[PDB]
Amino acid sequence: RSPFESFQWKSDIFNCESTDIDNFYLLLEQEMTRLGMVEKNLGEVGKYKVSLYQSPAAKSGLPSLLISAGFHGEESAGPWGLLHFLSEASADLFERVNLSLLPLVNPTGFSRGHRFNKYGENPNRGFVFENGKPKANEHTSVEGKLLLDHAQLLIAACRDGILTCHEDVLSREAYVYSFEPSQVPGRFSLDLRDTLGGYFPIAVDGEIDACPVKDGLIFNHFDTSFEACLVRSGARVGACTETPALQNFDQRVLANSAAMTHFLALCA
């Protein structure tokens, strides 16, 4: 499917269109302000800021975990899923974890309902790991460059876990890419897979790219994506969940919220 094809859904959970970025930010601000989270602006893309939000007064006894969403503008259940999750959270959460968020990496694609940003770039690629260091290549987008410029901040934010919430518009079946320092998947991988399995049928088999999925899982597959790069940079575990964008939008929002919840429980 074309990376400029526009996808839009109605959510009765939020009573709005999935591309309603103005409403998205209004609720995001309210939830961030209620939680006491600190904004760290990384830069701008087409008039929108791309910001990292962080829980205040991080403690070294707690794990530092990063949840990111909205690298691809048509995968809007990720960002709205994050809003859902936050609406159900209290500042008490920050006693269990040092949470950092990238709630919407690709705002220009998100307001248009399409995968690429409005400049025809793919914000989720071009993160190469060379000479023991994260680096850009010719595919790194404006957003990726902003993320790479803050590589040290982001590695620190996700040393104990990186979850990125994606969606697959070509799929009716859920699946998850995971990274664990093991030849075989463990509870981390299997629990996320099962959480999605509670909302959707699972990608029992096939291949996404040259990558085989078995029982909803793609394990330790390294590419030039933000997640793989951060895991190579030192993120102890990583997961990129894929909810199926051919299913009901609010189910995806709830699935994305459940996965974030489970991710935090598994890593805390």
**Catalytic residue, candidates 74, 180, 227, 242:** 242
Binding residues: 72, 75, 166
Q: Which is nearer to Zn ion, 75 or 180 (CB)?
A: 75
Q: Which residues of this chain interact with Zn ion, rule CB under 5 A?
A: 72, 75, 166
3-state secondary structure 164-202: EEEEECCCCCEEEEEECCCCCCCHHHHHHHHHHHCCCCE
Beta pairing partners, 243: 167
Q: How far is the CB of 74 from Zn ion (least distance, A)?
A: 8
Q: Which is nearer to Zn ion, 73 or 161 (CB)?
A: 73
Name the minimum Å distance from CB 267 to Zn ion: 22
| Cβ atoms within 10 Å of 1's Cβ, excluding its own | 10
Query: Is 143 a residue of the active site?
Result: no
Least distance (Å) between residue 93 CB and Zn ion: 26
Q: How crowded is the C-beta side of 133, counted as CA atoms within 13 Å?
A: 8
Strands (E), the chain: 10-11, 16-17, 38-45, 48-54, 64-69, 98-102, 128-130, 133-135, 161-168, 175-179, 207-208, 211-212, 217-219, 238-244
Task: Confirm if 75 and 245 have CB atoms less than 8 A apart.
Answer: yes
Which residue number, 109 or 197, has a Cβ lying nearer to Zn ion? 109
| Closer residue to Zn ion, CB minimum distance, 35 or 176 | 176
- Known binding-site residues for Zn(2+) equal 72, 75, 166
Query: Cβ 140 to Zn ion, closest distance in Å?
Result: 16
Q: Which residues are the active-site residues? A: 242
